[PDB]
Design an enzyme around this catalytic site. Structure first.
Site, PDB file in Angstrom:
ATOM      1  N   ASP A   1      33.398  43.203  13.875  1.00 47.68           N
ATOM      2  CA  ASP A   1      33.101  43.483  15.303  1.00 47.68           C
ATOM      3  C   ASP A   1      31.728  44.151  15.446  1.00 47.68           C
ATOM      4  O   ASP A   1      31.562  45.176  16.135  1.00 47.68           O
ATOM      5  CB  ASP A   1      34.227  44.312  15.929  1.00 47.68           C
TER       6      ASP A   1
ATOM      7  N   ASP B   1      31.864  52.511  15.048  1.00 47.81           N
ATOM      8  CA  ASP B   1      33.290  52.223  15.246  1.00 47.81           C
ATOM      9  C   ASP B   1      33.717  51.143  14.241  1.00 47.81           C
ATOM     10  O   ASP B   1      32.963  50.171  13.974  1.00 47.81           O
ATOM     11  CB  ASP B   1      33.533  51.821  16.700  1.00 47.81           C
TER      12      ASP B   1
ATOM     13  N   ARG C   1      28.129  47.693  21.518  1.00 45.35           N
ATOM     14  CA  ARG C   1      29.098  48.770  21.957  1.00 45.35           C
ATOM     15  C   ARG C   1      29.616  49.600  20.760  1.00 45.35           C
ATOM     16  O   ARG C   1      30.176  50.687  20.930  1.00 45.35           O
ATOM     17  CB  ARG C   1      30.268  48.141  22.735  1.00 45.35           C
ATOM     18  N   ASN C   2      29.436  49.101  19.531  1.00 48.01           N
ATOM     19  CA  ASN C   2      29.982  49.746  18.337  1.00 48.01           C
ATOM     20  C   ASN C   2      28.867  50.446  17.541  1.00 48.01           C
ATOM     21  O   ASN C   2      29.136  51.016  16.496  1.00 48.01           O
ATOM     22  CB  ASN C   2      30.777  48.730  17.511  1.00 48.01           C
TER      23      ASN C   2
END
Ligand SMILES: COc1cc(N2CCC(N3CCN(C)CC3)CC2)ccc1Nc1ncc(Cl)c(Nc2ccccc2P(C)(C)=O)n1
Length: 282
Positions: free
Chosen positions: A144, A165, A148-149
């Site tokens: 992923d 994350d 956003r991570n």
């Protein structure tokens, strides 16, 4: 629960338990929930586990603590420790004062003028690619890689980007970051992360736009399967777009590994034609 990485096995007992009395919450940062905090003084981010949660939620939280604790790389967020013996449960992470990259890009978009330049963007891409190369060398599949991570140490220059994350490691699947063999067959490899990295590059050089702007998940899946790829972001230099299109090769074997991505990013960083390209003013 056990966890192995870099040929060593760890369990909860190996995490650094910080006395609850030494932890002070300061403010909320976003969505569990994350706070700014202090450890007696070290500035931290504090990921909390809702006290009302399933047994699998508890285990998920534990695992995220073991995963992040066993990494040792400058472009992966450090784990300061945990506080798992009082409720609610805490994981203590390096405070990344620049925030998540997605928000940073959106909020630091040039407006009427030089809040960001092309080199800033290439430095972020380099930092994350170094992070991903470390994962790939250690046989860890992220699953992923996405803006956003990723997090930034500070808002201003000298900022360092890091992978933050590790939650992923149907309608919730991040289809728009995934190559055909991942969403079709559920085959994940390090070439999976390469594809996602291509999409992150697009996010970076678009200054925080949603990939495949107007398309739904299914539309993206059909588009990508049929050989469709995103257009270059606005004002994106050709050498940068070429990295994206190589990351998005249909065959995993034809995509570069992170050592090659890093080299190509460094070559872009050296090219005056690339770094003298103006970013669009919104
Ligand atoms: C001050 O430090 C932060 C500020 C923000 N901001 C970004 C702008 C935002 N804006 C300001 C302007 N306003 C009008 C609309 C809101 C406010 C919060 C967000 C995050 C961190 N730090 C931080 N360190 C470590 C972690 Cl580990 C983490 N984790 C984390 C925090 C939040 C979201 C996601 C994560 P992840 C990737 C998924 O772990 N987060």
């Amino acid at each position: 629960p056990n966890y192995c990485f870099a040929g060593k096995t760890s369990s909860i007992s190996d995490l650094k338990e910080v006395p609850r009395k030494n932890i002070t919450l300061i403010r909320g940062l976003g969505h569990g929930e994350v706070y700014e905090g202090q450890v007696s003084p070290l500035q931290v981010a504090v990921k909390t586990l809702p006290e009302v949660c399933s047994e699998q939620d508890e285990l998920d939280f534990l695992m995220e603590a073991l995963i992040i604790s066993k990494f040792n790389h400058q472009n992966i967020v450090r784990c300061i420790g945990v506080s798992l013996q009082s409720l609610p449960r805490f994981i203590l992470l390096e405070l990344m004062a620049g925030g998540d990259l997605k928000s940073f890009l959106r909020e630091t978009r040039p407006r009427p003028p030089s809040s960001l330049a092309m080199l800033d963007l290439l430095h972020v891409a380099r930092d994350i690619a170094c992070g991903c190369q470390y994962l790939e060398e250690n046989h860890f599949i992220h699953r992923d890689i996405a803006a956003r991570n990723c997090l930034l140490t500070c808002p201003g220059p000298g900022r360092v980007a890091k992978i933050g994350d590790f939650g992923m490691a149907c309608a919730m699947l991040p289809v728009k970051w995934m190559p055909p063999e991942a969403f079709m067959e559920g085959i994940f490899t390090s070439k999976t992360d390469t594809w996602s990295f291509g999409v992150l590059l697009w996010e970076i050089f678009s200054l925080g736009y949603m990939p495949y702007p107007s398309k739904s998940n299914q539309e993206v899946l059909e588009f990508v399967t049929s050989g469709g790829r995103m257009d270059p972001p606005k004002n994106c230099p050709g050498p940068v777009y070429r990295i994206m299109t190589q990351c998005w090769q249909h065959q995993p074997e034809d995509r570069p590994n992170f050592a090659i991505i890093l080299e190509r990013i460094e070559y872009c960083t050296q090219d005056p034609d690339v770094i003298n390209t103006a970013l669009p003013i919104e």
